[PDB]
Each structure stands twice: as structure tokens, then as C-alpha cells.
Amino acid sequence: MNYVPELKKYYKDSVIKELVKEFEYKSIMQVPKLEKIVISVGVGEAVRNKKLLDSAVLELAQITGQKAVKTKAKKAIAGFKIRQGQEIGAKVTLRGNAMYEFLYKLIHLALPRVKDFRGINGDAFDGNGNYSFGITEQIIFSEIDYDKIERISGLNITIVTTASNDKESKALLLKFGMPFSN
Amino acid sequence: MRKDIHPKNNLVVFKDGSNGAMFLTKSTLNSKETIKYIDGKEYPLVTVEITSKSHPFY
Amino acid sequence: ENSRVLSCQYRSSFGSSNARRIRAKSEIPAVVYGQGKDVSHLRIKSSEFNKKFAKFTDNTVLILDDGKLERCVFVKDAAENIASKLIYHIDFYEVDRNVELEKYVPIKLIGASIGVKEGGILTVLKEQVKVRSLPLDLPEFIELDLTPVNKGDSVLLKDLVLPSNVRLAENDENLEVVIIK
Amino acid sequence: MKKIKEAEQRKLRRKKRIKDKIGRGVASRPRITVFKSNRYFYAQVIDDSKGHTIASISTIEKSLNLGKNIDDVKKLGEVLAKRLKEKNINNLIFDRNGYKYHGLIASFATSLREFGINI
Amino acid sequence: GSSKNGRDSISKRLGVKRSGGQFVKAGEIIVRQRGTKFHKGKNVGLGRDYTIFALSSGKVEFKTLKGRKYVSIV
Amino acid sequence: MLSPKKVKYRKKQRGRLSGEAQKGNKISFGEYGLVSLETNFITARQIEAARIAMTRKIKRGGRVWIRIFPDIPYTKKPAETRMGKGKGGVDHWNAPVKLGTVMFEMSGVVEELAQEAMSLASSKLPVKTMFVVRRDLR
RNA sequence: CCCUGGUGGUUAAAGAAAAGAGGAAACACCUGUUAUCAUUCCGAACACAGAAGUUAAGCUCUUAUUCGCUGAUGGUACUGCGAGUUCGCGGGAGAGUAGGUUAUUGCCAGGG
């Protein structure tokens, strides 16, 4: 059995058809779809505190399911007293089935558990179908336990879509039921 | 891939206590309790107090 | 009509020294190109050119006669030495005498406007206007008197009184050439 | 758009570097290049002193009726060896042609090897 | 207040040693250079310091492709 | 004064300046120009003396454009020294002008007043000059 | 012979963007990760297993030259030489302008 995420089932069985009708696309897979979700977290303070970076990496692992990579400093800078090549950030890429499952978990479970959650700004679009927005308190995810955290942390989420514009991606996200603050 | 650096992903059923909706979602969280999903499949059941359709926003 | 005619004769010298000798003989080397023809190399009388076209602009058009043919040519270029007031080459771009064509033509402002007299502000929005005519009838520059233009008045493009066979070509007919606010 | 274009560009860069690392082929020891489509598998032997294809083979050839598996390319390499021996060429230089020497190409090359062709 | 500077190295005598069309035999030096001002074409080789030398007897020739100069022996 | 605010190198070699002008030899921003009839160097300070003269003569009538900027150091050894050490030190700045450089351009005023003002300017420069109207407009 | 795919030579943008046409074959997108392989995480690339679907994209052809690139003829700068001196002879730009330019070609395979 090729086990399939419920999001993938929902997409393939409805969303393709509604978007074809709604945007008069000539051929079927002109329809937008999702290629990757990038979860990033920038801990510049890790240059003092290694525990911060280790905790962030581990907590990302529990949140998603796959291990993270610690990015390095592209340039040595003094304003943040950064030496080139130091560990400064940590990111995870989600693709395919894991991507769909994570996005489902997020939208239905973790966005609800945010303090004063009143939707998400439906305008954080880079003009090319890529939607990036932040979450300040990782504790919204029930996966991580409260006691073991060493410092409350946030993280940025970027969703990359095959769409050529923002309208297409916003329509796809709305069909997915993404709680945009509107 | 190589296989030694990943937490154990598991299929999990999340149950809303309020609306009763259940979500099938592959969570790394091991739940002590087991539930028979609609599909006759056993899944670790985690009960979550707040979910999608029971938004104070939707 | 003569004052738009220019006498030339062909040259076959083609050298720096040769051109210097010609200009010593008080003529001007010149070339004519356009209409896909072979370039024509010729020479012009400097005194005649000075007398007739002492005020030549990019939009001046004239007639070249080699005794055997007539050509309608724009003064595409003229290599002038300012210190010695010396022309030392002319480029003539030929056009078809009967083909309507466009060209930006500058404006010339005359009169003292009542609005500016009384406290108006000149703002010359447009320094030129796109007109349309056969080559021989293109206006050298289009005149505009501001005297009746009072305060808070802009000049419409149609308001420009135009020579006979010259016609406006601007897409925006209602744009303002000069305003007095 | 740009992503497919850059994938193409990377493939071309690899191909070019491989070519001038292995050098050109001569009638004595010509060059064997391969191409791996989504459906088929192509091989050509080229003499660059002429720009001529001395011999060639691919899974499109109906008579062979091979597939696109390791087994099939093993048999295809066997056929290529027997076709080249009758044209008495035993030394070849192996242009991997922008691919990585692994899997299908590994089996192809080793099959040419077990039957007396110097690659 | 004397001069702060005045210091120059020995000239290294770079440049093309055999002109295009000349006949060379194997091993001749053709160009001495820092960097591939001229690149290598057929039948020549490049030393560890980018010297151009002839792998076989022949006649030097320079070609130009996309603005880069190539040296060959034909 | 008029002087560059930053230089790659503080001192540069005095070339030989010769030939007429093949560029910057046409009236561009104005109505009347002050061409030179020689090839020489115009210091920044003579430049600003001529500029004062023109501007002061013009009672707000129009605008003045300066078509040369000095950017060339002129070094001079200390007063009493010998020929020893080398390349003494920048003293003042020079601009290069060749026969046919427009050098100065004026807008707005009547031609008579412009001619007067610009002879008043020419009285303070080290080169012969000529006042030119556009010679292709009026 | 031609279309397509692959592989050489001839180096002038043989360049990108926008719009239209097709897709039989071929090619590409596309399917699944479970088999060997790869990723400083990620079947994205690559690797392997296959053919449900498509011209949407890549690709091919046709487009205004919209951007770029290339480029006349003259003239000028500059230059060799001269018992002609701002000259006499020889060579001759760059830039600008009239324009032009979205290649061509050798041979391997499939079949029109």
C-alpha cells in the first residue's frame, strides 16, 4: 500500500478540479501545487550559547520528524560580531508526503493553539507565490513538552508553490482552509 | 536516505474533546492510549483540547 | 522656393588630405544616404550653405540638385568647428518626398502672457510636439503666443495654430504644452 | 522555468568538463558515449578525427526487444561487443556523458568489459 | 624629508617567444605568462606556471573563439 | 573653491597637453558659450574669479554653467630646497582646456548683456577666448 | 531524403524576454521509494523501478527587433615619411549614423 496523506487525497480529488474551473486553465497540471516547505530559525545568540542552538535543532526535530541543518555565516560582520563560518541558523526542508502531513498538522492543530490567534496576514506574499510568515512561540506545537525548553523561541515558515503569482497561491491556500486573517 | 538520525514518525489520531472531530496525522508523539479509527486501523490517540473547526477564529 | 535648393557636384577624392584641399577651395564634403541607395559622395559650396541655412535645425529639410536629379534630404549631421566657424562635413539623410512621416518639432514662445504679467508661473511641460506632414512641408518650429493666456491657464495641443499641410500626431491630444499657474 | 534551465546548465557543464578530461577519440581507440532518456538508452562510438559514428545501439531497436533494466543493458552491451568485434575495435574511451558511473552505466560498462573490449 | 618609496622588481621577460606561423620542434616554449592569457589548443601543453609549449613539431597558430586566444600546433 | 573631495592618488605626472578639442566642444545647456582659443591649464581659482564676474554682472537674469572641473594636482617643492628628494606636494588645482573647449555657458539674459558679462569673465582667464551664440539658433 | 533525438565541425548574440502554432514517433514533464546510490536536512537534483496523462513548461517553428549584439560608406582623431609646412605622400580609427542579426553544417539511430 502506498499510504497517502489525507491532504494529498483532498488535493488530488477536489482541489485540482475546483482550480481548473476557477482559473480556466487549459491543461490539468497547469494547476498549482506545493514543492517545498522551509522551516528556518535564526539564533544569532548561538555564537555565545551553544545550548540555544542545540535546543533549537532538537526542538525542530521533534516538531517535524526529520533532523535539521545548522547554516553558517555567509559573511563575517561586526554589528552582530559575527565571524564567517559560525553556526548561526537552523533549517528543515519538507517535501512530498512529509510536507503534506506537516502542513495538515500545522493548519489544523498548531495555529489553533497560538495566543490571540486571529488568522494570518493574507498579504505576506513575495509576489511569486511563496508565502512566508512567522510563529513566535513554538510551544503551540503539542509535540514538544513545556518543561524541557531552555528558552521560548520562534521560527519562520516559507511555503513554495508552483504558482506564477500571488492570486493562485492564495486561492490554493484558501481551498486548503488556511486561516488567513481576513 | 540514511536512517539513524530521525525520530520515529507514527500515524496518530488526534481527537478534539470539544467537537469530536478526529484527525489522521503522522506525529512523532507516542500516545499511551490506542483508538480504533473509522478505517478499522489502530492508532495512538492523542486528545487535544482545541482544533481546527473549533476555532474561536473560524 | 530656391532658398531650399542646394547645388553640388560629385567628388572622388576620399582622403583626409583631399578633404582638406577641398575645404581650402572653400567647399564642404558631404555624403547622402538613405532609401537603401548607394551612398552619394558630393561637395557643396560653403558660401551658399552659410547664406541659406545659417540657422539649420534637426528638422530642416531641403533639396539637393546635382544638375541631373533632385533629392529631398534632412540635415542629419554637420561637423562644425566652433572656434573657426568652419563646417567640415555634412551628412544628408534622404527620405521619400511623398511619404507622410512623423517628427518632433520644437516650439517657439512669443508674446508676454497676461497671467505671468499678473503673477503667473511658467511651466513649459512640453518643449516639442509630434507633427506629421510630407517632408517638404515640415515646420522648422511651431510658434505660440502667450499674450491671451491668463492666470491658471494651460495650452492645449489643438490650440497651436499650425502651418497649412502640417498636422498633429500626438496620441494624447489634450496634454498641455505650457501652463501658467 | 529557471530551475529546469539551471538543471540543464549544470548537466552541460558536467558534460564539457568530462569531455576535456577524457580527451578526444581516434580511429584506433574511439569514444563511447551514452544517453539515458526516460524511456530508452543510447550508445554511440565516435571517431572525432572524422566526427563519424562507427557503431551505435539503443533499446529502441525492435529486434533486441530489451527493456530498460540492468539485465537488459547487460544483454545490450553484449550485443554491442559482438557488433564491434566484427569491426575490429577493442580499445574504447568511456565518456560517461554527464551521468554518474553507477547502476545502469556500471552494468553496461562491465558487460562490455567481460567480452574483450578495453575501456 | 626623503622619498618614502622607490622599489622595483626584476623584469620577467614575458610575452610570445615564437610568432604565429613559425616552425617549432617538440618541446619549444611558445609563450611565457602569468595566467592563461592564451589558452591551450591542439598539440600544445601548459606548464605548472601556465607556460605554453609544443608537444610536436609543426607550425604555431593562434585562433580566437568567443574573444579568447588559443595556441595550437598545425 | 572648486576641488575634488577624494582622490585615488595625491600626485600625478605632468603630461604634455596638445591638439584641439574633439569633445566637450559644443554648446549644450545654455545659449551663449565662452570657447577658448588656446590649450593651457585653468586653475580652480581663476575659474571661480570668472564665475563671480559673470554671476555678479547678471542681475538674476539667467543661469551659469561651468563646463570644466580642475581635478589635477599641481605640486611645488618647498621654497629654498635643492633638487633632491622628490615630488614635493600639492599646491593648487588645474583644469585642462584645449582649443575649442566651451569652458562656460550662460542662459536667460539678452545677447548684449551676455556678451558684456562674458568679456568681463574673459578678462580674468589666462587664455584667449571667443564668445559664441549658438550659430544655429539666432 | 525530411521530423525528432544524440554526437562533431564552422565562432558573428549561435543571446534572453514577450506572443502564437504542435507532441504520430522521439524527447521532456509526469508515478512510486522497496531493491543499489546520493544528500553537511530534503526521491528537489541524483539513483532505481514504469508508461496513467499532458503541451502547461523545457524543446521546435513562426513573430514586432521590444532589450542586447554586430556593423556601413565618408569625415575626424592619431600616425610613418618628406628641401611642398598647418602643408605633400602613405595608412587609418573609436564613437556616431544608414542598417543588419533569434545561425549554418558533417554523419548515427527510429519512420515517414
Distance CA A24, CA A31 (A): 10
Q: Label the pairing between strands C142-145 and C101-110.
A: parallel
Q: Is the CB of C151 under 7 A from strand G?
A: no
**Protein-contacted bases of chain G (C-beta within 7 A):** 5-9, 11-13, 17, 26-30, 32-34, 36-51, 53-59, 72-79, 86-94, 96-99, 106-111
Rounded to the nearest 10 degrees, the angle between the axes of helix A166-176 and helix A16-23 is: 140
Shortest CA gap C79–chain F (Å): 11
CA angle at D92 for the pair D91 and D98, rounded to the nearest 5°: 165
DSSP symbols for A90-137: EEEEE-HHHHHHHHHHIIIIITTTSTT---EETT-B-SSSEEEEEES-
Q: Per the CB < 8 Å rule, is C82 touching F37? A: no
What backbone phi and psi angles, to 5 degrees, belong to F55?
A: -60, -40
Buried b vs exposed e over F16-36: b needs ≥16 C-beta within 10 Å? eeeeebeeebebeebbbbbbb
- Name the method of structure determination: cryo-EM
The DSSP annotation for B1-33 comes to: ---SS----EEEEEEETTT--EEEEEESPPPSE
Does the distance separating the beta carbons of F86 and E1 come in below 8 Å? no
Give the count of alpha carbons within 13 A of C103, CB side only: 25
Sign of the dihedral defined by the CA atoms of residues F3, F9, F14, F18, in that order? negative
User: Which single residue is written with the C-alpha cell 506574499?
Assistant: A125
Say how many C-beta atoms besides its own lie within 10 A of residue E46's C-beta. Answer: 16
Q: Answer whether any strand G atom is within 7 A of the Cβ of A26.
A: yes
Listed in order, strand segments (DSSP E) in chain C are: 5-10, 27-33, 40-45, 61-65, 70-81, 86-94, 101-110, 122-123, 128-133, 142-145, 153-156, 167-168, 176-180
| Contact criterion met (CB below 8 Å) for A153 and A59 | yes
Tell me C64's DSSP state: E
Alpha-carbon gap, residue F108 to F131, rounded angstroms: 15
Judge: F100–C57 Cβ closer than 8 Å, yes or no.
Answer: no
Q: What angle do CA F24, F25, F29 make, to 5 degrees?
A: 70
Maximum Cα interatomic distance, chain E, rounded to a whole number of Å: 60
Q: Which residue has the cell 568538463?
A: D17
Closest to F16 measured CA to CA, from F87, F78, F132, F98: F98
Length of chain F: 138
Q: Which residue of E has its CA nearest to F77?
A: E1
Chains that touch D (3 or more CB pairs under 8 A): none
Q: Which chains touch F (3 or more CB pairs under 8 A)?
A: C, E
DSSP-derived letter for residue A29 is G
Give helix F111-122 / helix F44-57 axis angle, nearest 10°. Answer: 150
Contacts of A145 (CB under 8 A, 6+ apart): none
**The residue to which cell 594636482 is assigned:** F73
Instruction: Check whether residue D27 has its CB closer than 7 Å to nucleic acid strand G.
Output: no
Tell me, in Å, how far CA of E66 is from C1' of G13? 11
Render the burial of D42-53: b for 16+ CB within 10 Å, e for the rest.
ebbbbbeeeeee
What DSSP string runs through chain F? ----S--S-S--------SB-SSS-S--SSSEEEEESS-EEEEHHHHHHHHHHHHHHS-SSSEEE-------EEE---TT--S-S----EEEEEEEE-BT----EEESS-HHHHHHHHHHHHTTSSS-EEEEE-SS--
Which candidate, A11, A13, A89, places its Cα nearest to that of A46?
A89
Is F76 in CB contact (< 8 Å) with chain C?
no
D104 touches strand G (CB under 7 A): yes
**F91 grid coordinates:** 599646491
Query: In whole angstroms, what is the distance from residue A151 CA to residue A156 CA?
Result: 17
- Nucleic strand G under 7 Å from the C-beta of A28: yes
| Angstrom distance (rounded) from CA A133 to CA A156 | 6
| Burial class of residue C105, CB neighbours in 10 A (0-12, 13-18, 19+) | buried
Take residue E43 and report the three cell numbers written for it. 598539440
User: Which 3 state secondary structure label does DSSP give A10?
Assistant: helix
- Region of C177 please: left (phi>0), alpha (psi -120 to 50) or beta: alpha
**Nearest protein residue to nucleotide G110, judged by CA and C1' positions:** D60
Closest CA to C41 of C92, C107, C84, C77: C92
- In the sheet with F73-75, reading across from the earlier edge strand, the strands are F40-43, F90-97, F73-75
